[PDB]
Amino acid sequence: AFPALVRQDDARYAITVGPDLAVGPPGHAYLFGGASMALALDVAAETVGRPVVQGSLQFVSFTPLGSVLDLTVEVLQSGRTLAQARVAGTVDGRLVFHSGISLGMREGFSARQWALAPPVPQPDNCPPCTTLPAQDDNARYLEGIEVREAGGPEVPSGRTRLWLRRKDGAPLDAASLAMFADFLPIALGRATGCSGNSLDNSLRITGAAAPGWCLCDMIIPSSASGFAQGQVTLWDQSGRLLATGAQSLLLKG
Template sequence: MSKLFFDLQATHNPHRWYLPITPEICVGPTGNQFMFGGVGMASAVAALERTAGRPLIWATAQYLGYARPGSVVDIDVWTPVEGKYNTQARSISHVDDKEIISVSAALGARESPFDSQWVEAPVVPKPEACPVRHHWRGSEEGVHSRMDVRFAKGRSGFDRDGAAEPDGRTILWARPKDDLAIDAAMLAVMADFVPQGVGNALGRNAGGNSLDNTLRIRRIVPTQWVLCDIRISGVAGGFAHGSMSLFAESGELMATASQSLIVRVRESAEDR
């Protein structure tokens, strides 16, 4: 098993896992940190893959609450249908009796002569030629400090004020700073970068709190960087909807993601 971005631990029960919540997997201002939603989904994905013994096909998460540093998230996995080629599964991540994230998923693989993609990676400069993203709050801890993110299209933080992207599109390169393989769990972490596109779409220092996230795996190939092509479909009533295509450096489409979120416009570094 590959090394993970987080410290997922097994128990004596093969259907139960646990995740200690430390500042390294959290976001938010000092004193009000909480587990990054992408880590919550990624830890469930890792638990599902390890329980089923099969690779992820798709997973959809609904975010129900927050897990704070110092707490422990228990992840319970059910596999009600185990077929010849795929397993239908679900998980509940909870702190004591408080549900944090529920995930439904399918896992498996089968032989097929077909291997094509019709979504092309955008033509953008290589990561080394793109500006490094600096977190708008100036945070030097948590998830954002552990990811190397370079913007190929769009801006970050207050640099987005008055500079809306007319097509609602943000394109960025991302990789973990630690020596970690790109797997389904790592793609699940990156899939939660969709809210970064909201600020560029609006031309404001904006993001949001995810309500859900769906990750669909096509094929994972070796790559150091992942090209995240984020498209915000629309914003209304205080909510936004967006999607992402995740490509390897070779242009291989590895996965797609989509989510809805509560829009948050940040007027100062103290705002969440």
């Protein structure tokens, strides 16, 4: 998932943040929140040796483009049915994020889905998204993602539905899902009319998928007192629910 990620040991990892993992408006370039989540989940799974079920990450401070991000993993428990870990991200010893992650995978249970995918057009029947927010020329994460509008002429209030596809053809693994889940700030800009910053990221993974299109199905249901919240469901191209996510955001104003 992250070739540039270096493991010092079980528990300690580091990665230098390059333009490919950076976002921001002109004049700003920092590590994409979703990438932070992806990295936290990656190091947790790699340290524990089992797949992520869910994770929550709180953003404490910004990680500028070019920083070395140190990730430290603490395993709180690892039994036959479940493991739990915490992952701290630091730059130069400064805390930039902390997280709690549950890991596990049990045999003997069926896969079940009660939720039904919204009836959006298939990807090749959707136009490119020409309204992504302006980005610093050195913040190039978004350049690596193909985005199409899936919401149609009458998308409901507060909703944003995008087809997303990694240009690098990576599978729709935990890392990819964590990254796509952090497209909620774009949904906020649409809901408000203003092209906020995340306070946190939460991801709940039901299953992964092979490379392809992901329906990024978002809602911003409410805001008050300078903050907003959003929820997202990540589907494959065939209506299978891969993951859900959510976050709260600090409004620009």
